[PDB]
Design a protein around this ligand. Structure first.
Ligand SMILES: NC(=O)c1ccc[n+]([C@@H]2O[C@H](COP(=O)([O-])OP(=O)(O)OC[C@H]3O[C@@H](n4cnc5c(N)ncnc54)[C@H](O)[C@@H]3O)[C@@H](O)[C@H]2O)c1
Ligand SMILES: NC(=O)c1ccc[n+]([C@@H]2O[C@H](COP(=O)([O-])OP(=O)(O)OC[C@H]3O[C@@H](n4cnc5c(N)ncnc54)[C@H](O)[C@@H]3O)[C@@H](O)[C@H]2O)c1
Ligand SMILES: O=C(O)C(=O)Cc1ccccc1
Ligand SMILES: O=C(O)C(=O)Cc1ccccc1
Ligand SMILES: [Ca+2]
Ligand SMILES: [Ca+2]
Lengths: 328, 328
């Protein structure tokens, strides 16, 4: 039978092929949307691999006539209506260990770039700035702050959040976290302080860093209201999902100095541009193009795991044989 | 008597005044060199405070007719001929706890900026780059590498080096160090691996970071010869002293890709400019203007310690009353 497996928003299937060569016909669509996908794929695809760059609504999903499984090459699956997918008989899986430490390292890099102003100092030198005197050094590095004794607030203490917490302690951070879905006790296991409300987290944190999934109940978790609950001159870091932050409220905060700096690897509308959107003329901003996850080893790893999940689905029974189905 | 105390390469003495108000006449010179200092100061100054931006040769020192003590506001004193100073009856002191953790944090920021390419990714976005696909993300973030299992080589395991080592372990770095002046055993105390030669360090290290003082025997420690001993595609970080590196050899290494990236907070000639010198057209480079040390708290702390050292000298006996004399 050699069922059709399609890589939707990509053009390279080299890593996956050795794992699927004997049990699937593999093709790619290099599509940013379903409009771009061929009827043949929509009609015949039994399995699908996708990254974060394409979104599948129920309407998009309904276009697939033979699809039995979607595997996200990555951990986040907010870009798929998994509920409707399941109702349509489509299992959806992810790769949860995808770049856990890469993302945590990127998160720390961002935090350190804010506290040490390293990225901005480099930018200034590129622009031609000459820093001769100690007085000039202090002025150009104005805003740089000592880390020990500072409080880092983590929102979402999952895989990445935990990795971040452990690293943070090594710098002298006092680590707090807010995660309403976790059971009692993790705070004791990892030597952290837990707070029961988002407001508590924001109220006691000098630097806030997001590490929660994007779900039905936390769109614009950071908004006009909750930004006001953040400490004066606080930092914000986001390597989770752009939808978590109202970039309008963040822009205004940065301009008013209510927030001293922000570091974002994800944004409401991606790909990101410094010339398009609310953050266009916002100061004290660091941004990266959703690359917190990336390393060659990580990229290969998650693709290999995703292909194995596809193989388990074809060679076995759905959803019993699946390792990481997130819509049972 | 109220002896004269002069801040040579600065214009602000506000932090120092409350500590010296009753025992010294305090003035500033805002001088980049002795040519800029008034004869009155050269003739009458009994004590001097200075940063890193002015250098005192024996000839410069001979211009001081009443000078009994110099205190470096900072740890490094390579900018003073301390031997000749001592021969001329001039005690020289420093502030050794100056920004230890600030500098270590900056060092980690730099390391993480190289491994995660965060600063360069931001630079690219500022330049207008749009990163839409996963394929584009990999290409633009090409060079980003997983940290766990990587070997960080530390040259100079002093205060900053040790602070860096501890932080590095939290990221999964295998930490090695080379420091020929340390006694047996520190490696066991801190859980590190020690090597006996610089070549060994360079040969086994994916990322090399400098944390040694600049002295008579390590000018251009990194040179055409020793760069060849470094691993292929290795990283280099320097927050110690610019004189430690032959920037000609480093430039050639970066261009040839022998060295994948370098992060420098210090340089052979400071202030640094991307338009002037061997590193002008060198790729994969991060640079900051000797600001690794800076935080408001750190800046105040070291100035307060330096003033207290000045006070101990005036109110007591030299060099017995001194806390941090480095030229007994
Ligand atoms: N930028 C990148 O390249 C990149 C890479 C990996 C992961 N991510 C993102 O980072 C996020 C975290 O990934 P992970 O692997 O740690 O996921 P995870 O499932 O291990 O952790 C998620 C945690 O967030 C918590 N959470 C969910 N909603 C919350 C809310 N409203 N308030 C507080 N806590 C909440 C959950 O209880 C859970 O513990 C994901 O959303 C993922 O999409 C981004
Ligand atoms: N860029 C900045 O803002 C900044 C801030 C603080 C310190 N620094 C610099 O960083 C360096 C380290 O500072 P520190 O406080 O750790 O000093 P430290 O005296 O505590 O440590 C110096 C260590 O380097 C070792 N060393 C000296 N020469 C060596 C060589 N040839 N090979 C190997 N090891 C050698 C010594 O044995 C010593 O253990 C200093 O040179 C200082 O000037 C820079
Ligand atoms: O963003 C995520 O949820 C990830 O797991 C990282 C990622 C990003 C792009 C492709 C694959 C994985
Ligand atoms: O560079 C050093 O040796 C330091 O200790 C940091 C520093 C830099 C500039 C002013 C004061 C201290
Ligand atoms: Ca603050
Ligand atoms: Ca390598």
């Amino acid at each position: 039978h050699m069922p059709l497996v399609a890589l939707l928003d990509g053009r390279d299937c080299t890593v996956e092929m050795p794992i699927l060569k004997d049990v699937a016909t593999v093709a790619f669509c290099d599509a940013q949307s379903t409009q771009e996908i061929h009827e043949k794929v929509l009609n015949e695809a039994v399995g699908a691999l996708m990254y974060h760059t394409i979104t599948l609504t129920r309407e998009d999903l309904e276009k697939f006539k033979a699809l039995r499984i979607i595997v996200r090459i990555g951990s986040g699956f907010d870009n798929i209506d998994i509920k409707s997918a399941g109702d349509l008989g489509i299992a959806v899986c992810n790769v949860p260990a995808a770049s856990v430490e890469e993302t945590a390292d990127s998160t720390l890099c961002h935090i350190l770039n804010l506290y040490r102003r390293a990225t901005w100092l480099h930018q200034a030198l590129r622009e031609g700035t000459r820093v001769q005197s100690v007085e000039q050094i202090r002025e150009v590095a104005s805003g740089a702050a000592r880390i020990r004794g500072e409080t880092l607030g983590i929102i979402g203490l999952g895989r990445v959040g935990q990795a971040v917490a452990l690293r943070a302690k090594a710098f002298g951070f006092n680590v707090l976290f807010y995660d309403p879905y976790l059971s009692d006790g993790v705070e004791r296991a990892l030597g952290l302080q837990r707070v029961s409300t988002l407001q508590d987290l924001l109220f006691h944190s000098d630097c806030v860093t997001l590490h929660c999934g994007l779900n039905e109940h936390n769109h614009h978790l950071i908004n006009d209201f909750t930004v006001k609950q953040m400490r004066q001159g606080a930092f914000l870091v986001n390597t989770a999902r752009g939808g978590l932050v109202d970039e309008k409220a963040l822009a205004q905060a940065l301009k008013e100095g209510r927030i001293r700096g922000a570091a974002l690897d994800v944004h409401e509308s991606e790909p990101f541009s410094f010339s398009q959107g609310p953050l266009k003329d916002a100061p004290n901003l660091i941004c990266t193009p959703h690359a917190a996850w990336y390393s060659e080893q990580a990229s290969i790893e998650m693709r290999e795991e995703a292909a194995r999940e596809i193989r388990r689905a074809i060679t076995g029974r759905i959803p019993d044989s699946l390792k990481n189905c997130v819509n049972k």
